[PDB]
Design a binder for this molecule. Structure first.
Ligand SMILES: Nc1ncnc2c1ncn2[C@@H]1O[C@H](COP(=O)(O)OP(=O)(O)NP(=O)(O)O)[C@@H](O)[C@H]1O
Ligand SMILES: Nc1ncnc2c1ncn2[C@@H]1O[C@H](COP(=O)(O)OP(=O)(O)NP(=O)(O)O)[C@@H](O)[C@H]1O
Ligand SMILES: Nc1ncnc2c1ncn2[C@@H]1O[C@H](COP(=O)(O)OP(=O)(O)NP(=O)(O)O)[C@@H](O)[C@H]1O
Ligand SMILES: Nc1ncnc2c1ncn2[C@@H]1O[C@H](COP(=O)(O)OP(=O)(O)O)[C@@H](O)[C@H]1O
Ligand SMILES: Nc1ncnc2c1ncn2[C@@H]1O[C@H](COP(=O)(O)OP(=O)(O)O)[C@@H](O)[C@H]1O
Ligand SMILES: [Mg+2]
Ligand SMILES: [Mg+2]
Ligand SMILES: [Mg+2]
Lengths: 353, 352, 352, 351, 351
């Protein structure tokens, strides 16, 4: 099965995020979100079965044959880490493999503004990095955590399902817990995380009420907490967070957020104007006293207006302001910027200004 | 095989359904009316062997476990079929429906242009609802054929059973049949997020767990397709919200207000010509006002927004659709009035 | 075997039910009233051996597991039977109901011509209601036999248990028994729409889910038959609407106003001769006015429309039927007045 | 083993309802509701244990020793039936035994008015006999069922927990199912009762919503259904029945009750002025069209006013009218009549 | 044989509580303050053997199962005691209270006459509430002693553990201790209705099941006593209703409106004399208006009815009781104002 080795090598070499193997199609690779077939014959059921089975242990093979489903992770030394999923479709084996890179890119390499660098220096509070799946959230978080590891002498604990970016010890002590192996669940890790003397905590996705309450507790007890959401803007993120709670407990949730919130980042990856790379578009909200009052008063919407005027002082930036800058530097096309702008008339006005 | 010849005769005679049951010969529905084939009447041995001849072992044990079975299967070079096997008077019986190999286009199916714009949506939840056999699977197959044609993305479907097949075009299309490819809807949804999908078809919203999985998919940056047996957009939204406990409904309403991108409610009416059947469809496309009504739990008043969203968003109430079908003489006046949820409004449209 | 002779005596004497229990001789219900047979009283050994003699081993173990058992069985050349076996005072007891092989005609049953016109309806909901043993299943079997004779369509029945048998005539007739052919009414209704039916018998309207299934069937182009234990058309309509939550009653009323094609409410009265029984039936056939009253929630006033739909539509109130039965001397004056829902109206009709 | 026989014989002979055996007290017998100690020495733990164990099987003995609780029923031939409960208190055995008589008294012997006799002739519907525990409800129901058994050629089925009064076949076929032995539960008996070709059904206590739905279904499908409640008046009974259902389903419950209700009896037993007998006080509501309308319109309370004026036409009688009659005949004392009257001002006005 | 001497010394010096724990000698609370006995400090062997010396084997295994145990026990010829055994720093510890053989009377306890009229009620639910050690069991024991004295009825109590003992007077009194006589509150309530009771004490309303059982008992013609840790009648009613799911609260409110006969809310205050304690008690006796407020879910406004029901029904808010105790110089001004739930109302009444 030296074909799996060559297929995964091409996946790495061409900068693909995911490799897809299924019957009646050639192997296909996702690059910056878009699928490309490899110049190979289409696979049959024999091909897909032999190829997917070639990277499994006997226990994992029997587990797949017992369930027609299998999640796993594996490494190719000197090449990359991978997340694998094996399943069955149309009576035949299919497989998907996701890249977990060895190298974390820097802030400047990722296109992140200096305000993110100042956020990596925050001593305590809740910082949220949000966006849709595969919008660069884990990569940005890994860059911030790598900066903390480099600059501070503190204890960083991450809880991940699964562990993606690895952070070997630099000046910090870094402990990384994988759900389903190192710890039973997010709930159990968060149940014991406060007794483990942390300073900085990564909690992963805000998957349930319990994890949300844990993040509010972390931000209230003197820690810097990182979490993700799949929301697309700062205002949408705050409303989503508040509205998951029963109406009687939303006052407390709003007060907690008004006290502890230190930053909201909402990312999305857009195709570059060149047609091959992708560029990060990011909305940055850094709370000032006015925004904290709007949070306490339940006037969430008006926060967007504060972001429109917080450019010079705090490095704040609405999504439309970022799309404007990406458009003037010719990094994205006009169609992509307009097609994704949350308010096209504002972007038009900025383009006329 | 005998089954091969029976299904070949079904195809050759332009029949819509083949019926196999004891003490009758095989019968075929032609133009709505049953006709017996010139064959001896079947006994229980005949019906059981014939129906079992097109089942897998897993499907056989499922039928023997439940005395019910829905399934689909193909005869290469001939056609696909949807089968239902059941038990009556202590003996096996079966019904078999034709599923053509060639999928019709949006314009051939009578679907308005807003459905074509829905096939281009990048993320969100799109619901196609209506009673059983109201064209829901056919509309979704047309939409999925459009995504497959136009996008370079990963489409995964979970079906019980797989009906329309979507061979790879520009997309990678994976189709999982419950009871063979995957253990259940729950298991497929348990692993679907780890499979790098972009567009997902989840089938019928059969339980609370599946609804929560679909909300998670639609919230995490994917375009999710699902079906319900509701008859209108408002009825669909109320049905979706009301299945949850009262304390968790606020979040469900917030999720729907955020992720909803379209609601289609279909029904099939006999055409005025006598040969076709025509799709009547209610289309709701959420605007900021509708999303607010959803958050405020003012669901009913959404129908009023649909009454005025014709020019701006391509929206259309069921009565507006029956009216358009009536002015073009596609349906009779009796069918349009007999099916209109508000006959006085349609009357007013005729006075206008 | 003794049981063969007991059931033969039950058939020969025109009894409806045979009762077997300890410390009493076998007893037969004739025209509603019990009669002991000229035999010694049974003991626990007698009742247990007799009831067990007509059970399979699986059924015996089920009875011993639950102290309850429903079943149906046939005696070739004699009759079908519905059996119930239970336990009382620590001993076995059993009841057995006659299911005749021959279905009587409309004219033999005393059913008016409007019922014959109802057997020709292409789609909709037709309800046959009344108390237990009021002739509902027999009327439904006559209607279904008429459809089987006249149409080339697919009839599916769901029964607990199967009572009247309908061998294929011009139709394909499939009959599913709950607890053997299908797990439940809910499961049969879950798959019945995927079985290409034209006419459906669903049995008793036992819960809301079955009601929604019947409304869906009647709205999707099918003719649906069901029973209720209500005693009048108005009482039936109110009962159907009032089982739903207040917020969904508007929809239920609109559905009923669209799909309802007939309501029959039966009761069996002793004949004046003392030997036969005569059917008294209230017939409601919806006209546009009644459909409007249904949509406007003015249900009671429907009785007034039935009072005047005699000449035009063949409609008939229960009191009008008792009046006709009284003038033809089919029933006594005491029975007609004693059963009339409004004795002053019947008096006025008698003075007219 | 020969002490229990004498104690139960004494229980029967003195007309007591229950015998109580517990440590540091002599045996005590409930007569007309009040406990009387027998002229015997007080029992110790050895006495109570041996005496209670004397009427148990080995299976029942080990079941009691496994759980410190035991319910059972048993018969003494030629004497009576009994319901027994054995339990443990203060580390010692205790026991209670309730009488189940072989003989059913007549309507006239029980003090029941003729309207009850006309209720035993009702061909269909729901008839409710209510009152507190031990207020004569099972005895009245047994008398009515014995009347149906005597007069009709129909099928009577009873579901009981446990079976109390026994109805041997007369002109009817009578089947009696005991919960826990003959049938698994009220739910199972009602799951199969409609397939057992009944005409008259006794369902016992209205334990839950499911049993209520079963009784309404039985009443609306052409059967005469008997049930009990522990309410104290017709109005209170109707309100309790309606109020147990969710608000959205109460319209249907009120419509069903308005259609099927044929009678409500609310009983209580009062000490006779003589000091030795007890007398039945009974409230009788028989629905007329006006009352059925009040039921449909949710105007339940005003039904009491109809009962005040339905005396001559239907044999109706409020509780206060019954107490007034009992007081005029000096069957009860003034203190008992006033102390149990639901409206003392009305009774004062009538007097 | 050391425990006997330690409890004897506890009794002789008039101490209220005995405390035994490791690394300290035995300590006795005298006039509220701890005094160590002139004995060597206990080790873990000492404390475990001493505490285990007054436990049954069942109670020992329950303690080893839970590291907690509440119980009561007697020393013949001496006294009863309430014990709590627990674990601290890996070692056994124990606390022991005196339970006197003589039950005080209503007048000796400071209970108003309405409580005496409550001891005569024929049926219903009577609640005596307040925090732990507010006199609830003592008040209940006084009421039960009054019923035992005055009635010829059957009293059954279920207790965890049994506190006051009620020897038979004119009633038959059976007392079941959870964990010895009966498996659980649930099992006792499973069989209590088959034991022919008239008056029942059910202990703490520990869960929803016990609440439903108490409501069934109260509606089936029995007088039911129970406790809660609420501090007022309004708070008690709201606490009882709000435990149930929203859909069942209508039925619970209807049941309470029908069966409730009294709500008693107690607390013990230091006497102005410095040596006695005085009972402060809020008394709610339902009238038709209060029952309507219960049915209509207007619970709060019930307090206003208590404010005006003093002359007619013997009703009394907590503030009115504190006002009376202050006028009689039974309590100090600081104690009354400090414990009053509404100091502004008490100030207006006083001044
Ligand atoms: N600023 C960026 N510029 C270019 N590529 C990026 C950037 N950030 C992330 N990526 C790349 O694009 C892919 C995004 O993957 P990832 O960062 O893990 O998204 P994600 O939000 O964590 N998805 P998920 O955890 O499943 O919800 C990765 O393969 C990165 O290599
Ligand atoms: N019009 C009629 N005239 C005379 N006899 C009839 C008539 N209709 C039915 N019967 C007879 O009277 C009996 C009625 O039984 P059936 O028709 O099954 O009532 P049912 O409503 O179906 N009872 P159930 O299913 O238990 O609710 C049958 O034995 C028939 O033979
Ligand atoms: N009208 C009556 N007059 C005098 N005594 C009566 C009368 N009715 C019943 N009794 C007697 O008083 C006792 C009442 O017992 P019973 O009739 O079983 O009450 P109950 O309502 O059925 N109790 P329960 O089943 O536990 O809720 C019986 O022992 C009867 O003998
Ligand atoms: N717009 C349409 N116009 C005419 N016929 C249609 C249309 N859509 C579907 N059909 C056909 O009517 C039947 C509906 O079947 P189907 O779409 O599978 O219903 P279901 O919603 O239960 O999946 C099929 O035969 C289908 O080919
Ligand atoms: N009215 C009262 N007046 C004075 N002392 C009382 C009064 N009631 C109880 N006590 C005493 O205070 C303590 C209360 O104990 P107890 O009644 O058992 O509290 P609980 O409510 O937790 O069961 C006991 O020592 C008791 O003797
Ligand atoms: Mg990630
Ligand atoms: Mg029938
Ligand atoms: Mg009874």
């Amino acid at each position: 099965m030296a074909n799996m080795h060559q297929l995964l090598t091409e996946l790495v070499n061409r900068g693909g995020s995911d490799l897809h193997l299924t019957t009646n199609s050639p192997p296909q690779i996702r690059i910056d979100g878009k699928l490309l077939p490899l110049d190979m014959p289409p696979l049959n059921a024999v091909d897909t079965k032999q190829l997917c089975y070639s990277i499994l242990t006997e226990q994992q093979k029997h587990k797949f044959e017992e369930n027609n489903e299998l999640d796993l992770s594996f490494g190719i030394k000197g090449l990359s880490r991978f997340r694998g999923n094996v399943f069955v479709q149309r009576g035949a084996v299919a497989g998907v493999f996701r890249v977990i890179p060895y190298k974390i890119l820097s802030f400047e390499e990722l296109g992140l503004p200096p305000v993110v660098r100042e956020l990596a220096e925050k001593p305590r509070g809740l910082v949220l990095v949000t966006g849709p799946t595969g919008s660069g959230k884990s990569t940005t978080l890994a860059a911030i955590i790598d900066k903390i590891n480099t600059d501070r002498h503190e204890h960083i604990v991450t809880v991940e399902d699964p562990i993606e970016y690895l952070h070997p010890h630099k000046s910090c002590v870094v402990n990384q817990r994988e759900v389903g192996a190192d710890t039973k669940s997010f709930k159990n890790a968060l149940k014991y995380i406060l007794r483990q003397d942390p300073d900085v905590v990564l909690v992963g996705e805000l998957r349930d009420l319990e994890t949300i309450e844990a993040a509010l507790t972390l931000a209230e007890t003197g820690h810097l907490c990182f979490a993700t959401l799949h929301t697309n803007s700062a205002v949408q993120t705050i409303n989503r967070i508040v509205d998951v709670f029963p109406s009687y407990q939303q006052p407390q949730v709003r007060a907690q957020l008004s006290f502890v919130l230190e930053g909201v980042l909402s990312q999305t990856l857009l195709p570059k104007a060149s047609g091959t790379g992708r560029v990060l578009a990011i909305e940055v909200m850094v709370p000032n006293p006015a925004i904290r009052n709007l949070i306490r008063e339940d006037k969430i919407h008006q926060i967007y207006s504060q972001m429109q005027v917080g450019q010079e002082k705090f490095g704040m930036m609405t999504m439309n302001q970022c799309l404007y800058g990406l458009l003037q530097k010719r990094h994205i096309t006009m169609d992509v910027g307009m097609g994704r702008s949350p308010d096209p008339d504002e972007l038009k006005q900025m383009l006329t200004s």
